[PDB]
Ligand binder design. Structure first.
Ligand SMILES: O=c1ccn([C@H]2C[C@H](O)[C@@H](COP(=O)(O)O)O2)c(=O)[nH]1
Ligand SMILES: [Cl-]
Ligand SMILES: [Mg+2]
Ligand SMILES: [Mg+2]
Lengths: 137, 130
């Protein structure tokens, strides 16, 4: 069992001499900081997606290597998203596992015109409250 | 050993019949547009939940661990669609994240002399040949 990306963030925060082991209500300034970071990386991802679409619209063919800047920015977005969960003292893997379980159960649902998977009749959402509760004991 | 979150996305896309290439693969524009839309949707929900928490705190509410559940759920949904973009591009998210992490952690050990920025182009080259 190698380290997860969530565990990596925990390692990173310690390394920079900075997070709780259990779910911990944050100060307002912490929430505002995490929002700022999400917005910054999100904007950089958007810029790269826009640029790839623009090159395609121009009639250019994309190589695999052309995807590097987008992949970098998506990983940066992962980094700050995991970063937020870690600062809240929330095990991202525990939450993600439950979100995943409920996502799997969408398979019989219809699809949106753009390709988004939608929810079938009778679908039940992930119980993330339940995850937070057992993480805090 | 549990699957990684990236590996979970592969399972999900296989289950719903969405594209999930084994190796890095230049996508059609339709795929890129969907990834942008999903990122925008989940980032808006995260923003909504952060805003709710802020507004409650401003009114003097003492937040409990349980109060973090909606935000935690939306942050995980944002991870989900971010991993999902990488998976649909056929790019191993764990390999790219590992390189970003190496760079970030390295930078904090200083900026060190001999530090090397994340080389994601290099990771993508190795993925093509694994
Ligand atoms: O095509 C899809 C549709 C949904 N999701 C995921 C991301 C989130 O975890 C969640 C959000 O879906 P909605 O609640 O917006 O329907 O399901 C995808 O990854 N791809
Ligand atoms: Cl696709
Ligand atoms: Mg960035
Ligand atoms: Mg959501």
């Amino acid at each position: 069992c190698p380290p997860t990306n969530a565990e990596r963030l925990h390692e990173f925060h310690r390394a920079i001499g900075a997070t709780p082991e259990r779910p911990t209500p944050p100060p307002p300034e912490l929430l505002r900081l995490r929002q700022t970071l999400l917005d910054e990386e999100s904007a950089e991802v958007r810029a790269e997606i826009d640029h790839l679409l623009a090159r395609q619209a121009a009639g250019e063919a994309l190589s695999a290597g052309d995807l590097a800047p987008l992949a970098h920015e998506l990983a940066d977005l992962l980094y700050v998203t995991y970063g937020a969960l870690d600062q809240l003292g929330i095990d991202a893997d525990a939450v993600f596992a439950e979100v995943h379980r409920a996502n799997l159960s969408k398979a019989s649902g219809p699809r949106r015109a753009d390709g988004k998977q939608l929810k079938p009749e009778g679908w039940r959402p992930a119980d993330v409250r339940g995850v937070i509760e057992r993480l805090q004991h």
